């Protein structure tokens, strides 16, 4: 179950496999398996990690459909592999992969945004090892994210009534047809590494939870006592594990020795006096150090955590008992050359921009992000809504068992990976699925999502609130969204409807707000905005102008400020990002308050000024 | 019936009333009648000729709905008006106008793009006269151009299924809802002037036609003989008119004296030996001087004309018996400050750009242009397709008698105004009306348009071909377009459908071309293109990039080059232009091969190179 990030210490070593690999395109539905047996013929270079799509301008890899094959060689000293458990880890391969080592099929994985690993202890040998990775970019009615099996792309234009169009369509080059509004970047998007653990016995998983806070200070910087719980899982094979809690200075402030009982597990509680709490804009991190005992140490893992509680109470969202207000945006892992490839420089910069903006949060739209970003937000005090790639879903998917299982895999996987991060305060199990309509459609959606809501709660030891991000729909026939712990709505009044009429947009908004006022749940924006080309200006700003984007947030935010039960504003988007091409996408999605190069539009400055005056706690 | 452009000579004088007028906005469906009786209170300045919408950044006049009121004073010497017929002419008031002089109602008008005039001989007085003009910008289901009585604008975004949206819309500020893709610029868009004629008898109209050419030279520069016909109409009351034909140097090369017969009218024929012909890229103009005889002259008018024939023969378009090929675009009267206001500096520049591009033609999409532009094209050898404002029409309009009458008014008005221009070779009676579908819809469309086709032929003494510009539709059920003299098609394969896939776009195009091949009419493009933001670049050009626009024309034009019956390529558009705001309009319509400031995008350079190698005559 556990997927702890690979760590180097006195018992463990990590060997990164990132760099410039060999690369070939393959077929729409196959690749030569014999490529795993020998070096790739006439290979291209391809940097790892990164999307492959924008790394070769001679080819049109954005138009590629089907398989590609990665390959490299590597060698490690025999004395290091000696007697160790050897694990090959892929942080992410988008969307599906077959992995070979020295011609042996290790196995396969579906899911483009979560890590997977293989025990390669027996497949390794001395000298050069040959690592071959086939990657499948194809999406469809059974994938998450959801693709279309025929027709158009998300908001795609057609003149189906023309006989000539209908015929040409049947003979067109086959392409991925996304039911989502972000480009299908594929490949080894995140790191690849080989790591070691002890073989006889090793720590397989660690879970830390904040169970109770006693007598929280007025400023919530401290609690008189904090009761935390640990749960350690072991693999391999009156054994014991030592748990030391390190404060921010490395001083051991608490420690217990727990017995391991066999599913080898050790669990218990630890009381910490005058515990320092983790808050938005004021992070504090402890380290839980677990050491497997035989004075010698068998195995060890250092797990960062933060002490904080999260509770939905009525129409309030309480972090350490204080009413929190979300200030932020949905993001994307998107940048010019890397595509969906992880880039720690960009992550560090983006975190600084969030502070510059005086935002305090974002959502991982529309997939779990690279693990390093959460670590970064843990230490920088930025709150996260963590979301699985369940985007583009409709009734066709709810009836599909493969989809249901892939959806369960993602929810359990995301939470298994991310459970220990204090910055994560809420889980999102889908973005804009079909939930409304007539007949049995609302009930069908509910019956699909309710067990996923329950699963997210069951999987998370911290028991954080669970939500589903709702598209702009008929909210009166939608019966699912209102049952979530927090109502998260995507609304584009004045952009996709009532276009350009801000008086009418605000009037319509207030009408839907009157509806939600009665539901009595806490409600927040997870999307709202307007496409905006930097440099377009007007004295009376029209759609696509910098001025209109500014006016838009000013008019909308003035309305939600009148609602005490309205607990957050996360806009769309942090920055312009790449999409499938189309008549409404001007070099991608331009709803960023920043450009793709992270430069601030007029609206960013206005938002920065507004957010500077809004406190993390007690705004409402 | 005649609306000769006002002329100054020894019998006639023109007094221009252009300049900076007084101006007030008024109500959605009324204005204060006393504003005609006295100076406007607290007036704004408003230059005229010009649209009013972009002349005041303190107001949002683009959002204005209903009436505005113009006013100025003027005074002329009594000795000039004495014994003269006094006429006040409005070259254009968009869309409807009520005109007052000195508190007296002169009358009203509805056509927004054609001239109208009043006899003010008796309403004028000595000293300052007060001229008040109320202008109505409203469009709807009975106007040409066509507006929507409710709902949305063109290619407009909606979420009607949301209850909040439905309610807000019913309370929204009233706005014009166009069924066309160009902004509803309104006001005194063209010149205003007072002119004089003799009172007792005067020249009211002149029509010149090329009846026959005998033995045209091999280079079509001359004909051994040209038979031209004249028709002069008189107003007022053995009278005679002298008709002198002047060549380009002012030399009298022919002269006849004709008897006036009573609708007092004189008509006859004149033979011109070794006549110099008017051709695209090689214009030649004569002047017909008509002089009403009492050695004294009663009245006189100089009418410019050019000697050329136009004939559709099979799948060829013959000018002076030679097979012509259209190279060009649809235009707009559109510019940054003037709006739809006429600007002869811009007209002169645009004409030089047409030469720069090596284009030879354009269409007056989607309304008759200012008269000065046709004079310009007469002397510069650019061919024109002249079009009435019948845009946005569908079955709702075909059943409305008021629309039918306004449509007949526009066709007769356009042809009465423009009949003498040699540069005009074809008439267009609509742009993209609804023609297709099932049941009686194709037949209903046919029955509406056939008598308008016949009317256009009956109204034009030169009997030029008549067309109707057809939208991208179901060409198999459309029964109207294939009966026009030239088939003019607007096609957006690869933009609005098969988006971004030029292979599939060309495949679909060729399928429709296979259809038109058998119809046996000459066929041309009147629209095709792709929105393009200057400065957006890619190695593999996607939609909105300069490269994609270039690739688009390159792939499409290669296909039509294979069809001998395809006699012209007029793209969309000459230059970026203003539209109603919406999610597919990035600061207006960006399908220009030039920017709104008339700067060339990449495609313009490519098109210039292609057109440089295509001759006006004999390409096919
Ligand atoms: C109003 C109904 C349509 C709203 C759709 C808004 C879309 N939501 C999900 C995001 O991934 C898209 O980028 C966003 C958009 O298109 O910018
Ligand atoms: C593909 C079927 C619809 C095509 C419509 C294309 C439109 N025709 C008339 C022009 O006035 C518009 O500007 C043009 C467009 O939108 O650029």
mmCIF file of C-alpha atoms in Angstrom, chain A residues 57-60 62 157-159 161-165 167-169 171-173 436 472-476 493 495-501 504 507-509 511-512 533 536-537 539-544 548 579 581-587 590, chain B residues 57-60 62 157-159 161-165 167-169 171-173 436 472-476 493 495-501 504 507-508 511-512 533 536-537 539-544 548 579-587 590:
data_model
loop_
_atom_site.group_PDB
_atom_site.id
_atom_site.type_symbol
_atom_site.label_atom_id
_atom_site.label_comp_id
_atom_site.label_asym_id
_atom_site.label_seq_id
_atom_site.Cartn_x
_atom_site.Cartn_y
_atom_site.Cartn_z
ATOM 1 C CA UNK A 57 10.489 20.281 -33.373
ATOM 2 C CA UNK A 58 11.437 18.129 -36.388
ATOM 3 C CA UNK A 59 8.534 15.881 -35.489
ATOM 4 C CA UNK A 60 4.972 16.766 -34.548
ATOM 5 C CA UNK A 62 1.878 16.829 -30.107
ATOM 6 C CA UNK A 157 -16.342 22.773 -33.342
ATOM 7 C CA UNK A 158 -18.086 20.828 -36.129
ATOM 8 C CA UNK A 159 -20.493 21.183 -39.063
ATOM 9 C CA UNK A 161 -24.673 18.430 -41.243
ATOM 10 C CA UNK A 162 -22.250 18.818 -44.147
ATOM 11 C CA UNK A 163 -21.965 15.461 -45.972
ATOM 12 C CA UNK A 164 -18.378 16.295 -46.960
ATOM 13 C CA UNK A 165 -17.402 16.869 -43.324
ATOM 14 C CA UNK A 167 -17.041 11.648 -44.766
ATOM 15 C CA UNK A 168 -13.627 13.289 -44.297
ATOM 16 C CA UNK A 169 -13.951 12.684 -40.556
ATOM 17 C CA UNK A 171 -10.751 8.993 -42.922
ATOM 18 C CA UNK A 172 -8.964 11.523 -40.704
ATOM 19 C CA UNK A 173 -5.688 10.695 -38.949
ATOM 20 C CA UNK A 436 -27.535 16.801 -13.356
ATOM 21 C CA UNK A 472 -21.746 25.026 -14.109
ATOM 22 C CA UNK A 473 -24.945 23.009 -14.341
ATOM 23 C CA UNK A 474 -28.603 22.797 -13.365
ATOM 24 C CA UNK A 475 -27.925 22.927 -9.621
ATOM 25 C CA UNK A 476 -31.586 22.156 -8.825
ATOM 26 C CA UNK A 493 -21.246 33.820 -15.163
ATOM 27 C CA UNK A 495 -17.895 34.567 -19.604
ATOM 28 C CA UNK A 496 -19.498 31.422 -21.050
ATOM 29 C CA UNK A 497 -22.979 32.841 -20.469
ATOM 30 C CA UNK A 498 -24.348 36.379 -20.194
ATOM 31 C CA UNK A 499 -21.113 37.162 -22.020
ATOM 32 C CA UNK A 500 -19.619 40.530 -21.104
ATOM 33 C CA UNK A 501 -22.649 41.671 -19.086
ATOM 34 C CA UNK A 504 -26.411 40.278 -15.389
ATOM 35 C CA UNK A 507 -27.572 38.952 -10.774
ATOM 36 C CA UNK A 508 -27.450 35.348 -11.964
ATOM 37 C CA UNK A 509 -24.703 34.559 -9.454
ATOM 38 C CA UNK A 511 -29.652 33.780 -7.622
ATOM 39 C CA UNK A 512 -27.535 30.608 -7.453
ATOM 40 C CA UNK A 533 -4.449 38.319 -23.794
ATOM 41 C CA UNK A 536 -4.992 43.978 -24.990
ATOM 42 C CA UNK A 537 -6.408 47.102 -23.337
ATOM 43 C CA UNK A 539 -10.962 52.192 -21.434
ATOM 44 C CA UNK A 540 -14.118 50.118 -21.192
ATOM 45 C CA UNK A 541 -12.686 46.628 -21.022
ATOM 46 C CA UNK A 542 -14.270 44.008 -23.241
ATOM 47 C CA UNK A 543 -13.683 40.236 -23.196
ATOM 48 C CA UNK A 544 -9.983 39.282 -23.702
ATOM 49 C CA UNK A 548 -12.162 43.069 -18.368
ATOM 50 C CA UNK A 579 -4.421 22.957 -24.562
ATOM 51 C CA UNK A 581 -6.030 23.642 -30.389
ATOM 52 C CA UNK A 582 -9.449 25.139 -31.157
ATOM 53 C CA UNK A 583 -11.348 28.331 -31.990
ATOM 54 C CA UNK A 584 -11.695 29.399 -28.325
ATOM 55 C CA UNK A 585 -8.078 28.629 -27.352
ATOM 56 C CA UNK A 586 -5.594 31.376 -28.267
ATOM 57 C CA UNK A 587 -2.253 29.582 -27.896
ATOM 58 C CA UNK A 590 -5.536 32.288 -21.426
ATOM 59 C CA UNK B 57 -14.299 57.190 -23.942
ATOM 60 C CA UNK B 58 -16.111 58.748 -20.972
ATOM 61 C CA UNK B 59 -19.254 56.929 -22.098
ATOM 62 C CA UNK B 60 -19.735 53.357 -23.268
ATOM 63 C CA UNK B 62 -20.788 50.755 -27.916
ATOM 64 C CA UNK B 157 -22.058 31.405 -25.876
ATOM 65 C CA UNK B 158 -24.938 30.249 -23.624
ATOM 66 C CA UNK B 159 -25.888 27.973 -20.725
ATOM 67 C CA UNK B 161 -30.210 25.147 -18.893
ATOM 68 C CA UNK B 162 -29.082 27.045 -15.779
ATOM 69 C CA UNK B 163 -32.122 28.569 -13.971
ATOM 70 C CA UNK B 164 -30.108 31.533 -12.669
ATOM 71 C CA UNK B 165 -29.042 32.391 -16.219
ATOM 72 C CA UNK B 167 -33.852 34.704 -14.913
ATOM 73 C CA UNK B 168 -30.973 37.198 -15.129
ATOM 74 C CA UNK B 169 -31.392 37.404 -18.911
ATOM 75 C CA UNK B 171 -33.802 41.560 -16.492
ATOM 76 C CA UNK B 172 -30.611 42.411 -18.423
ATOM 77 C CA UNK B 173 -30.042 45.837 -19.998
ATOM 78 C CA UNK B 436 -31.058 24.484 -46.813
ATOM 79 C CA UNK B 472 -21.241 26.595 -45.300
ATOM 80 C CA UNK B 473 -24.342 24.401 -45.419
ATOM 81 C CA UNK B 474 -25.907 21.195 -46.721
ATOM 82 C CA UNK B 475 -25.248 21.837 -50.408
ATOM 83 C CA UNK B 476 -27.336 18.788 -51.383
ATOM 84 C CA UNK B 493 -13.001 23.584 -43.736
ATOM 85 C CA UNK B 495 -11.329 26.110 -38.977
ATOM 86 C CA UNK B 496 -14.969 25.851 -37.845
ATOM 87 C CA UNK B 497 -14.931 22.140 -38.665
ATOM 88 C CA UNK B 498 -12.184 19.511 -38.872
ATOM 89 C CA UNK B 499 -10.403 22.056 -36.712
ATOM 90 C CA UNK B 500 -6.670 22.250 -37.369
ATOM 91 C CA UNK B 501 -6.603 19.160 -39.601
ATOM 92 C CA UNK B 504 -9.036 16.259 -43.580
ATOM 93 C CA UNK B 507 -10.407 15.987 -48.307
ATOM 94 C CA UNK B 508 -13.778 17.464 -47.319
ATOM 95 C CA UNK B 511 -15.736 16.189 -51.897
ATOM 96 C CA UNK B 512 -17.809 19.373 -52.121
ATOM 97 C CA UNK B 533 -2.957 36.840 -33.812
ATOM 98 C CA UNK B 536 1.903 34.105 -32.345
ATOM 99 C CA UNK B 537 4.376 31.683 -33.905
ATOM 100 C CA UNK B 539 7.318 25.553 -35.941
ATOM 101 C CA UNK B 540 4.187 23.482 -36.483
ATOM 102 C CA UNK B 541 1.563 26.194 -36.696
ATOM 103 C CA UNK B 542 -1.569 25.649 -34.634
ATOM 104 C CA UNK B 543 -4.794 27.645 -34.857
ATOM 105 C CA UNK B 544 -4.272 31.403 -34.203
ATOM 106 C CA UNK B 548 -1.273 28.120 -39.535
ATOM 107 C CA UNK B 579 -17.168 42.803 -33.681
ATOM 108 C CA UNK B 580 -19.551 42.323 -30.799
ATOM 109 C CA UNK B 581 -17.560 40.806 -27.924
ATOM 110 C CA UNK B 582 -17.648 37.036 -27.420
ATOM 111 C CA UNK B 583 -15.496 34.018 -26.578
ATOM 112 C CA UNK B 584 -14.328 33.453 -30.161
ATOM 113 C CA UNK B 585 -13.606 37.127 -30.873
ATOM 114 C CA UNK B 586 -10.162 38.226 -29.673
ATOM 115 C CA UNK B 587 -10.576 41.999 -29.854
ATOM 116 C CA UNK B 590 -8.883 38.320 -36.429
#
